[PDB]
């Protein structure tokens, strides 16, 4: 109980700073955000993506609600977390640190599983509908929680140990241990290494999903929208046209466009066989349109123009009656895909940028001897690292509340429409 670098280890006298006020206001904000997000999410459910998001939010809310009153009661007696009850000495610190590490690892693992599922569904449709079910996907959160419990129970075995960080309240993983044993340093490096691997895997899955979605967007546009637009433009040209040669030229262009477009494929049911009924209805509509092109061509070869324009009008009628449904479904599916990927990316960047400094602190403070003052260089930096770790559970539901709120949902829809 005598150390120069962490001199707050045995100090039971807390400092009367503004730590309690900031802790209280941040806990209040976090609880308000958790409650509001769960209320906004309850009635929509009554997608595997959104049930995973709901499970993540429930785990976060349970963790915050469990850890806040302990610190509140420790501050209530205006003493440290070293001892609050005579029979529970030095156990409050261990419980606090164990739960904090447990919830951090569980949250990271659930974000990784969310991103992996999203990329897989956008990338491997056969494996998407082949194996996983929603009942099978509902049990990942107990699995992740159990694994986090298994990993964070290792310090109780003896390979690692927890230490108290001043003022009187924090408890966390021992970091430097006077450049001593390989046990504590091994635990710290293993922990930060696991977090680094998870962060890198999440970023890789995000990039793979973005590239696959970009590929689907390009394929859809080239296969259907250009052919649709040349059909519509040549219909306008015929409606303006006056001579038979121009009409025959325009109808040759439409024939090429319709044949190419009948070769296309909608973004949904890309796994489906070409003999599926929706595909046959797509093909049947284009067969009727091609036949009417042939009728107008036959009738315009004989020098008569008005009847060619009449058959063009019939083309317009069947075009609206048979074709628009698949195009509309295509674009709606694309917008939903972009929405889900945007939510995943905006959580990923936050997790990485708030989890980096502890990784840096454990990396730099492991392979380095004693240096610089141990009063404000170590302590302020460690308090900063702990604050950046703690920010995760506070701002996690709020950005989701901002994005899914219907008024800002429409505002972002207009923002996306603007370019």
């Amino acid at each position, epitope marked *: 109980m005598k150390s120069p670098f962490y001199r707050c280890q045995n100090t039971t006298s807390v400092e009367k700073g503004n730590s309690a006020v900031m802790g209280g206001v941040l806990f209040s904000t976090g609880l308000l955000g958790n409650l509001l997000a769960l209320g906004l999410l309850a009635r929509s459910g009554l997608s595997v993506f959104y049930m995973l998001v709901c499970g993540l939010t429930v785990t976060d809310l349970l963790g915050k609600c469990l850890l806040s009153p302990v610190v509140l009661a420790a501050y209530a007696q205006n003493r440290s977390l070293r001892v609050l009850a005579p029979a529970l000495d030095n156990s409050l610190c261990q419980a606090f640190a164990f739960f904090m590490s447990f919830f951090g690892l569980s949250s990271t693992l659930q974000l990784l599983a969310m991103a992996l599922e999203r990329w897989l569904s956008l990338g491997h449709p056969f494996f998407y509908r082949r194996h996983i079910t929603l009942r099978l996907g509902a049990l990942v959160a107990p699995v992740v929680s159990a694994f986090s419990l298994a990993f964070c129970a290792l310090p109780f075995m003896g390979f690692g140990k927890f230490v108290q960080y001043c003022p009187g309240t924090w408890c966390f993983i021992q970091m430097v241990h006077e450049e001593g044993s390989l046990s504590v340093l091994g635990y710290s490096v293993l922990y930060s290494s696991l977090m680094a691997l998870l962060v890198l895997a999440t970023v890789l899955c995000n990039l793979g999903a973005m590239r696959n979605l970009y590929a689907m967007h390009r394929r859809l546009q080239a296969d259907l929208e250009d052919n649709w637009e040349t059909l519509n433009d040549n219909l306008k040209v015929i409606e303006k046209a006056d001579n038979a040669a121009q009409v025959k030229d325009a109808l040759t262009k439409m024939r090429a466009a319709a*044949l*190419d477009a009948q*070769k296309a494929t909608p973004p949904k049911l890309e796994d489906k066989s070409p003999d599926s009924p929706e595909m046959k209805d797509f093909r049947h509509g284009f067969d009727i349109l091609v036949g009417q092109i*042939d009728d107008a061509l*036959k009738l315009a070869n004989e020098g008569k123009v008005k009847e060619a324009q009449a058959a063009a009008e019939q083309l317009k009628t069947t075009r609206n009656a048979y074709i628009q449904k698949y195009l509309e479904r295509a674009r709606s599916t694309l917008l939903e895909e972009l929405d889900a990927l945007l939510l995943l990316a905006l959580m990923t960047v936050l997790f990485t940028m708030c989890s980096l400094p502890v990784i840096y602190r454990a990396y730099y403070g492991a392979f380095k001897d004693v240096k610089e003052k141990n009063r404000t260089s170590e302590e302020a930096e460690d308090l900063r690292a702990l604050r950046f770790l703690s920010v995760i559970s506070i701002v996690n539901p709020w950005i989701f509340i901002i994005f899914r709120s219907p008024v800002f949902r429409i505002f972002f829809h207009k923002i996306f429409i603007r370019p």
Partner: antibody, heavy 124, light 109 residues
Framework: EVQLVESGGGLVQPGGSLRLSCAAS????????LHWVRQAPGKGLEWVAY????????SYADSVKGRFTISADTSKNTAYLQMNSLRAEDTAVYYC?????????????????WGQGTLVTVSS | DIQMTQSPSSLSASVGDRVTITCRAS??????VAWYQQKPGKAPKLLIY???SLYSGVPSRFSGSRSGTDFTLTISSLQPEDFATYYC??????????FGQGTKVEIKR
């Protein structure tokens, strides 16, 4: 079996007339359209004319239109080409071919069956 | 009209080479392109009928490929009964049909 047979070619004077007869066997003319193609000595292929039996539709090339006439009759299962004001640039070998109907596989196979050829010589 | 240009003109090759002929369209005719073979004093024969599809009967060493408005006929290995003239055609409708120029393939010595 499917078979197309031509007839009616020979030596004609400039300004003379000739009649070519494409007779089909093993299938019905009523279910297919018929086309005439020609090849000059030392040169490549060239489409000439088109008849559709059911619709009555008829089309001719720009070197040919106004001087040839294609026709058919399904009672005797035959198609005809009539050549009227012949020049020395019309001496060639002439072939007859079929093409199926939309929709389906029959349209996407264009000229799967061809005739046998007949030589037309225009010299004074 | 829809012009369509063929290249080369007089390819020289030997038994076992891999031969490639290119045909080029002036418009988009979709994939409605065919390839024919002709011997001296005979009638043309169909090989590829939809820019990539093999007509029933011709051997499998002939292949056709589309990439935009550029079409490629490939003979992967050659046998003595492949020295002939080869033709390109587009067929978008009944009344508009255009052929290429032909590419005669000879023997190398």
């Amino acid at each position: 079996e499917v078979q197309l047979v031509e007839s009616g070619g020979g030596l004609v004077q400039p300004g003379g007339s000739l009649r070519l007869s494409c007779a089909a066997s093993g299938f019905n003319v009523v279910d297919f359209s018929l086309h005439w193609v020609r090849q000059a000595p030392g040169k490549g292929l060239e489409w000439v004319a088109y008849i559709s039996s059911s619709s009555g539709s008829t089309s001719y090339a720009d070197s040919v239109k106004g001087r040839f006439t294609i026709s058919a009759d399904t009672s005797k299962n035959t198609a005809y080409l009539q050549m009227n004001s012949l020049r020395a640039e019309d001496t060639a070998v002439y072939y007859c071919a079929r093409w199926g109907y939309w929709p389906g596989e029959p349209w996407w196979k264009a000229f799967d069956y061809w005739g046998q050829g007949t030589l037309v010589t225009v010299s004074s | 009209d829809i012009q369509m240009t063929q290249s080369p003109s007089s390819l020289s090759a030997s038994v076992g080479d891999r031969v490639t002929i290119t045909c080029r369209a002036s418009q988009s005719v979709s994939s409605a392109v065919a390839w024919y073979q002709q011997k001296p004093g005979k009638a043309p024969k169909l090989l590829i009928y939809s820019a990539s599809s093999l007509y029933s009967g011709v051997p499998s060493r002939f292949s056709g490929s589309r990439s935009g408005t550029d079409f490629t006929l490939t003979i992967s290995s050659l046998q003595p009964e492949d020295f002939a003239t080869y033709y390109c055609q587009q067929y978008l409708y009944y009344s508009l049909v255009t052929f290429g120029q032909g590419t005669k393939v000879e023997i190398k010595r």
